[PDB]
Amino acid sequence: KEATWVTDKPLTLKIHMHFRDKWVWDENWPVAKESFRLTNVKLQSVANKAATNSQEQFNLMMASGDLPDVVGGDNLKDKFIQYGQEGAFVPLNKLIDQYAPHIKAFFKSHPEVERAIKAPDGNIYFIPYVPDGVVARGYFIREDWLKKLNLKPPQNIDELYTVLKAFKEKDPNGNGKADEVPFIDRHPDEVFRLVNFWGARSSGSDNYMDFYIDNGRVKHPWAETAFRDGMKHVAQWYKEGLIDKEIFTRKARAREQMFGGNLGGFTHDWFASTMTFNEGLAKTVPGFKLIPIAPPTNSKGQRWEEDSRQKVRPDGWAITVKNKNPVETIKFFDFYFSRPGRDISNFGVPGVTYDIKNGKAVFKDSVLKSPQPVNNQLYDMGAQIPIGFWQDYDYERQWTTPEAQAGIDMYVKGKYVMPGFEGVNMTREERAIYDKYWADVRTYMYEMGQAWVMGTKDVDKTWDEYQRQLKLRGLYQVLQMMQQAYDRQYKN
Amino acid sequence: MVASVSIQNVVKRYDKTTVVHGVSLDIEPGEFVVLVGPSGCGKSTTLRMVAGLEEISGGTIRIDGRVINDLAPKDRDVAMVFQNYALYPHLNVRDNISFGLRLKRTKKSVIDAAVKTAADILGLQPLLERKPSDLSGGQRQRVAMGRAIVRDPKVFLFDQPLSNLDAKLRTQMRAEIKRLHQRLGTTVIYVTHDQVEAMTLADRIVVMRDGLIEQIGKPMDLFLHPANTFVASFIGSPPMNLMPARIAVDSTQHVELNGGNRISLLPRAGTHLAPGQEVVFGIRPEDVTLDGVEGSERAQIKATVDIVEPLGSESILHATVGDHSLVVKVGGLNEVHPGDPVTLHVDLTRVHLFDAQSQASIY
């Protein structure tokens, strides 16, 4: 028996969790086994590990007719509300009130967090993932490649253009080849973010391809006519070879290839893990120094950093109607908002990943000295997964390097960070349009943008037909329906 | 065993058309009877009907007192030899012979005296252990006959047993069949596309053309007195010469031929010939001779030599009288040249006449 046990008798449950098209839940995970020992509840995964797309697996499992107990994952928010209203997911509200003191206290201390996850009716069908921190993404560049090639770090778009051009033409590495690639990333969507250099937005928030608010009007960044001016130029960048050709494909293996193979000159990504490489691969690549830099001056004469870390991003897990044990499950979810739950979810497992020192959790030397980023270890260990756990920023502060912290402080002090888009509260009737249309619209936008970057299509030529297709796909219907909310919410 | 078999009005029909029509034959116990004829016909269908491999659409057939119309092939008390040798390649020779018997018990059947006697009759001591794959055709048909006799049935059914063997091997297996039937003596019905085997083996020959049963009788009865022009043409080592002919002024004493040839005929009461009657005159090649040997002068004929084919001590002479040609067996030892006219002497006793219309035997 344990003090954290949510049940006296052992409870084994069927959980389907497929997230980020990478990992599936594993009951043999150290974090999962620890979770079972502490909560006396074992989560047995029913999923295809051989599967690729997570969203597809969610849709197929949902359309299968046979529902599991708990359903976890990322970007399921809209879907959680959709199938929540349809009765595939049980409202946790009274379950949270009665049986979940920690979650209730959290939602009491965080009304704005609770507001976003609420349905039109106001119910909460899922326990959300709540990332803790201030910033998210910032621009990084090779310090060594700025030296032997004799070029001062770029203060603007022109200097960055000349620097990347110098990376492609002149040899920054010295293998004697043009094989080096000026710009990379592990997220393909970042190839759009480059339009910030021309003063265009790739999104309104941390979530890619999201709406935003301009002077009291709801607008989508891609639908604007300032978007194609930037897209033309990033298509020019892709054409000159400044952007990785495989940027839409490569993904998770990017940084461990381009930087590992010493072919990358530039990246966006994140602070901590990008600065982890400087310590990690320093042995294999001798002259590698990656440094944080302020965002280059755009064509609008401004300093723009678009991505900001958002609270309660659309991740989490939910309880089905076939669960038959809502109490032990809402208690189980309540555990991850508790201190030990946050400990095992953020820091991995004690005696292995971390230890308890002076009322805090401190990572082992084995974890901190690892060349592989800590979070990447935790992912395989079953930690920092998009469950309903509350994230602890200290965990990130531990493996955050002084240079990384200096870069973060630089970005915060410089106020380069643009405000995040919270979203709006739509009623039952007006949300259906969003739910139905926005998926197809977003997918279409993604495909078109990808076609534009790779240069398979012409921006200016296909722009009109693109606009009309956006019109007949019900984009502006969702836009006007979003304004229908925002205008009622914010006034003066 | 020794048992009689009676076939009464047996008929088999395929859809609207009817292959066999009302075939009726009575077969004495231990009698050798051969069904002989062209390829398409119901002789094989008849044998198959006796075997039980094909259904009886009408009429009744029985062996001894048992009616076999409704029966199982296993209980039909008959054994059949096929044209395809019917032996399984994978099983051993001894195992092949013992196939049918292996279904009934084992051991106390003893199988030893049976296969010993069978293989001794067919004369194979070493072939007991062998495979059909590595044997010759004649040996395969022989051991097939061994499977037939190991059953010890009331009736032996042969369907064109050696079609595929060579003539050299065929005459041998023929003689062996004759000896076998002379030894055992069980009732046997035999089917052949060859006239020779029918003539040699059969106690009784039944000829079948596409249709019903054409004729029955002893081999010499069919050779001497053909029922029609077909039987006449079918039986013999050479085919019987059949050429068109007529009668003009005198009937019983005259028959006229194409090239201006005229033959005096023996009276032979029981004829009922007609003057002016269109007739097909037949004659055997052995019954035609050269010129003036014996004769004389009222049996002769005039022709022009077409070709001569020496066989041996004998020779085959093709002679053209009118627009048609008749064949005559001659001595191989005489010098004959093509293109020069020749006189042929026909035997008046062995001549045959048939009707152009009815086609039956007239003379």
Added chain:
Amino acid sequence: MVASVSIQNVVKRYDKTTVVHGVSLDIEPGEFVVLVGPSGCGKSTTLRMVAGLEEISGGTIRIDGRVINDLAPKDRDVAMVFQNYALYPHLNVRDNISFGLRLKRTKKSVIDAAVKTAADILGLQPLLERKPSDLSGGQRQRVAMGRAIVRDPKVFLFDQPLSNLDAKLRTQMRAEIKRLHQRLGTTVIYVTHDQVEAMTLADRIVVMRDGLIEQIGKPMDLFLHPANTFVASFIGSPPMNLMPARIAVDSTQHVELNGGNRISLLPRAGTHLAPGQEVVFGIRPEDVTLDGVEGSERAQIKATVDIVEPLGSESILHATVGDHSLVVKVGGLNEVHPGDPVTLHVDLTRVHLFDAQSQASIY
């Protein structure tokens, strides 16, 4: 297109075998010569070597003065009729005959008149628009012969043309072949496994066993005077008896066989055989009779009847002398029956003897 063909010491080797060994035959222009023998020898291989379809491993073959060894079949001035259906199924008969000429195209008048003459010879005029899908076997062989004669070669090569046909069609097409040779008169080599076709068609018969040429000569030369026991066994409708025997006692006169039977021999000057010499005695079935020499002066052989095979006007009598058996041709009735003793009368002029070790005549 009348030309002689000389074959000198030809030998064909396949993977260290040498199927045919040093075969040498000279063929006069317009002569009909038949290669005949049992299966497996190089009779077909020789013909094919002349055709050019197979390579000559040694020796030379030539037509007239030209050596065709390194030549091509097209330029060899020869045409071949194969045994199996050499006509193309999609093309019509007229298209079949004109195929080879259509290969070089040119003047349509030539391929027209050529096929007209050919079809006039073989009676292929009505069949001109017909297709090989529906045809007789004999007709297929006829249009194949049409392929042969439309070439107008120096040599006609026939490889077992009548093998796939039936007995009736073999006997018919054989006469048609001889008749055909009377017209054109082109030099022709003919290959057969059948003795009959060889006897009838050939001006000269050459027998070949196991790649070796056994004997050459006229049909009557092989029939009357066989070089050895094999040639004696091969030619004739029945096989020559060929049974073991000895002499001792008197040498130049008497020879005794089997169970103590003794035969008096004609002087036959030039023989000088030895007494006690191991010998194989043989005689033809046509030269043995039943009691028909009316109290013969030479005291002929005695036997015991095995089986009787009624043929027709003649009949086949199997008679067993001691441990061996000889076959004798008899009349049509002749009661006999198996098991009763019988006296056989042998013709003293037609008797043959061979040696047991050396298989040659020696008599």
Added chain:
Amino acid sequence: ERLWKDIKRDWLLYAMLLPTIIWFLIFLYKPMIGLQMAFKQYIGFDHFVTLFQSEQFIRAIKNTLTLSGLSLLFGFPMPILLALMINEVYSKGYRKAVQTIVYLPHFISIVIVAGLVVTFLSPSTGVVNNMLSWIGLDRVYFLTQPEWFRPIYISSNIWKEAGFDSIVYLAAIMSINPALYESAQVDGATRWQMITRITLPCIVPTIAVLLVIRLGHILEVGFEYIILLYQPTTYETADVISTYIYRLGLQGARYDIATAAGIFNAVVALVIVLFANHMSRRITKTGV
């Protein structure tokens, strides 16, 4: 009457035939009932117009027809050509090795073939772009380019199936009696004269049957390849009716319109194979 009497004898035969019939009635013909049912929900007959007017689906049947044409034209004769070429080979060992090598890729799995494609054609990785860089042809990203999809497809397809499909034709031309060729040799026919005037017209019915069988599945051509290697950029040219049916029906979970497209494709296939069988019947020897 008769049938009972025949059944009494054949009972252990019919007993053998029954389970197969049951299998076919269950796993095949029952989905046809479900086919008649999937027509209406969620009459009916209306979403056939949704198929009639769409910019996604009309280009799918467009590319289905296109891919059918290309696969026919380039793909179908290649095994016949391979068979003819192998047939003309001497030195049996050489022809043996050739047959081994050429028949081999058929046994390679389709996803392994696609893997070979994506591996070989990967930019600055695969051997193809490297060999192109060696000659100074620069580089090309193949799987992201809609222009290159079909050539890559049919090339990998002939690489995989040409030999194994050539086996049948090779057996067909070896079933011809030598006399037809030898009598032509005596007449002085050349090699090309023989392959044209006898070989081909003799093998015609075989290639005809194989042609109508090919036309049977011609609408489903390359489904499992396309379902694998088609990129969002190449979706335009790559998308085929079968792929549409899969993506909407199984993935997108829309059964109605996908099943309707299934009916369309199946009916058109049955019609085209009916006309194919008819024209291969009247003109050629027999048929199916």
Added chain:
Amino acid sequence: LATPFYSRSDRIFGIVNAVLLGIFALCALYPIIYIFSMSISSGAAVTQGRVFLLPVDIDFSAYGRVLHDKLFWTSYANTIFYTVFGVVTSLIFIVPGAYALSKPRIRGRRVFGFIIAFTMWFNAGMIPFFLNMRDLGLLDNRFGILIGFACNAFNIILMRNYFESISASFEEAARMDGANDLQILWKVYIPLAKPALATITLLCAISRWNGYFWAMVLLRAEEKIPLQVYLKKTIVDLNVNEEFAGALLTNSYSMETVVGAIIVMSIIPVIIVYPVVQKYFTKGVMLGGV
């Protein structure tokens, strides 16, 4: 064919024929030896544009990566299971049914022959088939993958056609000796059917081994998944965890060498059993490896 040699145009024809066929053969063989060498080769060399035909510095580590994969071997076991029992369950339905369809005396010979053959030129569809798999309760089931397709009309009419090519004298003699139906089929017709049995079992084997689509569609549980599906994940999708991405620099094998190694280990049994099969089927001069 014949062996005249002789003529010139024919000589050149044959030579250029052998040359073209040779080139095509080399183009066919090239990818195999390539992926072999590359799988053996180092990740660095493969990355730089090195390798091609022969290996360079090799590695041998990528095979270590694929040998430590549990789902790979599990899926291999799944393919083995599906091939064996799938082929067996196929033969069980096919052979006796084709044997019954072969015999000329049947009442429904016509209509049953139609019932089978009709499935060739007309199919219900992908979705109605999947739905029929759903209500049969065969989803996410190995037996559902086995009995799901045990039968192709092609194999049935082929087995039937080969059965009909056998002389009826054997069956008839068996009936004469008292053998009835089944006992016949086992004792004579089946050992006579060995070539057709080999062809069918081969086609079914390669059908089960390389089967991908319906395997991935009808199966959910990862332990039931066949090698081809897992291959669809690793080989052609190429998307991977941060774990494997972090395992790139700590190893020195590339991802491409891992891929190549996987497809090598996948095609190895094929390369092993192929010469035996072809040796069995040719049995003479060429005629093919059917």
